[PDB]
Curated annotation (Swiss-Prot):
Function: Acetylates histones, giving a specific tag for transcriptional activation. Mediates acetylation of histone H3 at 'Lys-18' and 'Lys-27' (H3K18ac and H3K27ac, respectively). Also acetylates non-histone proteins, like DDX21, FBL, IRF2, MAFG, NCOA3, POLR1E/PAF53 and FOXO1. Binds specifically to phosphorylated CREB and enhances its transcriptional activity toward cAMP-responsive genes. Acts as a coactivator of ALX1. Acts as a circadian transcriptional coactivator which enhances the activity of the circadian transcriptional activators: NPAS2-BMAL1 and CLOCK-BMAL1 heterodimers.
Protein name per UniProt: CREB-binding protein
Result, substituting residue 40 to R: Impairs binding to acetylated histones
Residues represented out of the complete protein: 1083 to 1197 of 2442
Phenotypic consequence of residue 107 to R: Abolishes interaction with ASF1A
Outcome after substituting residue 94 to E: Impairs binding to acetylated histones
Bromo domain mapped to chain residues: 9-116
Post-translational modification comment from the UniProt entry: Methylation of the KIX domain by CARM1 blocks association with CREB. This results in the blockade of CREB signaling, and in activation of apoptotic response. Sumoylation negatively regulates transcriptional activity via the recruitment of DAAX.
Protein source organism: Homo sapiens
Subunit structure of this chain's protein: Found in a complex containing NCOA2; NCOA3; IKKA; IKKB and IKBKG. Probably part of a complex with HIF1A and EP300. Interacts with GATA1; the interaction results in acetylation and enhancement of transcriptional activity of GATA1. Interacts with MAF and ZCCHC12. Interacts with DAXX; the interaction is dependent on CBP sumoylation and results in suppression of the transcriptional activity via recruitment of HDAC2 to DAXX. Interacts with phosphorylated CREB1. Interacts with CITED4 (C-terminal region). Interacts (via the TAZ-type 1 domain) with HIF1A. (Microbial infection) Interacts with HTLV-1 Tax, p30II and HBZ.
Disorder noted: Chromosomal aberrations involving CREBBP may be a cause of acute myeloid leukemias. Translocation t(8;16)(p11;p13) with KAT6A; translocation t(11;16)(q23;p13.3) with KMT2A/MLL1; translocation t(10;16)(q22;p13) with KAT6B. KAT6A-CREBBP may induce leukemia by inhibiting RUNX1-mediated transcription. Rubinstein-Taybi syndrome 1: A disorder characterized by craniofacial abnormalities, postnatal growth deficiency, broad thumbs, broad big toes, intellectual disability and a propensity for development of malignancies.
Amino acid sequence: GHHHHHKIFKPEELRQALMPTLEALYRQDPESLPFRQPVDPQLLGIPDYFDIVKNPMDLSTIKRKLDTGQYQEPWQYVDDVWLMFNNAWLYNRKTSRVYKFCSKLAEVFEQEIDPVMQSLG
Ligand SMILES: COc1ccc(N2C(=O)CCC[C@H]2c2nc3cc(-c4c(C)noc4C)ccc3n2[C@@H]2CCN(S(C)(=O)=O)C2)cc1F
């Protein structure tokens, strides 16, 4: 998650600072592939997905929000990234490939976001 630590940012400043962290997620192949589009429960034959997951998130949604300047503060981007991870950890079993891939992306994200957040203050 995001955590407070003891500033209005322009959308282009956010995009510049944060986009590399998203790019690092997309670069993980094959780990990012299940996360690049919204989960489609009809194609996947999982009618209970939206019972468990009330607030879906994925990389395409995050990218669109960054691209269109929807995040006002870096913590909002960080929250959406963790939402995506937490949803995947919640729904899928720990034995599954997609859960393991989720964990791998979260490790990459933690490593990349930390120095960025320090900079942005
Ligand atoms: C590249 O990594 C994967 C590639 C394929 C798979 N899958 C299988 O191994 C078994 C067949 C179904 C497939 C698959 N499972 C997915 C699960 C999710 C998902 C996530 C994330 N959070 O909750 C759920 C449920 C998402 C996609 C899954 N897929 C494939 C991978 C890409 N597609 S698609 C065509 O819908 O974009 C479906 C799992 C993977 F982790």
